[PDB]
Amino acid sequence: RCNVWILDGDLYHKGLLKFAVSAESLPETLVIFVADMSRPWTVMESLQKWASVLREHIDKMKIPPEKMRELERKFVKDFQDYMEIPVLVVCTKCDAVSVLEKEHDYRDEHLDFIQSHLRRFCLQYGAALIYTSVKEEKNLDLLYKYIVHKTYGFHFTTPALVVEKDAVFIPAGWDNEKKIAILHENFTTVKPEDAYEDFIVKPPVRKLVHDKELAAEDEQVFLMKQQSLLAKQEGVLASFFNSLLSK
Amino acid sequence: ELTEEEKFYRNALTRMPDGPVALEESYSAVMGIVSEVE
């Protein structure tokens, strides 16, 4: 049985992480990072937020530098040895892509943009990317198999799927900048180096802006003001009718 | 539309007077009993 630890989204509870991972239990732990595809625009901001939180957590652990470099060597050896600590990025509510086509006029270029961003981030952290949909039950068994493989060392056989928009799967080591360059061919307006935020926009949700506080004047200032007061006492039609007048 | 945060006092956990200390003791105590049983 594999221990499961779900941290609340607020940083106020991030200090609970010390009770989820310890020095003895760090190598046995597999890290899962969730990305919400119903809110794609915050995905990388959230990912650098939580990854940075994990880096800060590992900093407070005070692992010996030799042991830390040993862990890095083990992880990288697992990395380059791939043929056709661990970090796995899981995308949730990818079926909301169907919403993005109808509500925000997205297209294959935008989806290529976000997934190329996600694969470059996975390269940065050496992670495996996967797309899921609990609503549609997509890639759940593929997930479970990969999780068991990477934790218990079980076998794995599924290949990398990078053609379908909402079912992408990339095991660790598969991705590379040359392999990521295929999506940049589909780009016709944006570039790989363009900023996330300028192209993909965070919608300005029409929150109820509470009205200005209307305040009654104080009695003294009001009476002073009253004392001061008391003591001192069509075209388009014309265009058409000009058009039919010139001729 | 009213979100879950607006509907209920989910954020009240962050308004404890002694910070998150009391929440840690709750989680720690669960860790202590499990450590002994294990």
Characteristics:
part of a larger assembly; 2 chains; A: 247 residues; alpha/beta; four-stranded mixed beta sheet; 4 strands; 7% strand; flat; B: 38 residues; mainly alpha; 2 helices; elongated; methylation (chain A); Cytoplasmic dynein 1 light intermediate chain 2 (chain A); dynein (chain A); cytoplasm (chain A)
Quick overview of this protein structure:
This is part of a larger assembly, with chains A (247 residues) and B (38 residues). Chain A contains 9 helices and 4 strands.
Give your account of this protein's structure.
- By secondary structure, chain A is α/β, with parallel strands linked by helices.
- Chain A has one domain.
- Helices cover 46% and strands 7% of the residues of chain A.
- Chain A is built from nine helices and four strands.
- Chain A has helices spanning 43-61, 65-80, 97-103, 108-125, 140-152, 177-186, 196-199, 219-232, 235-246; strands at residues 31-36, 87-92, 128-131, 169-170.
- The relative contact order of chain A is 0.11.
- Chain B is mainly alpha-helical.
- Chain B is built from two helices and no strands.
- Chains A and B meet through loops of A and α2 of B.
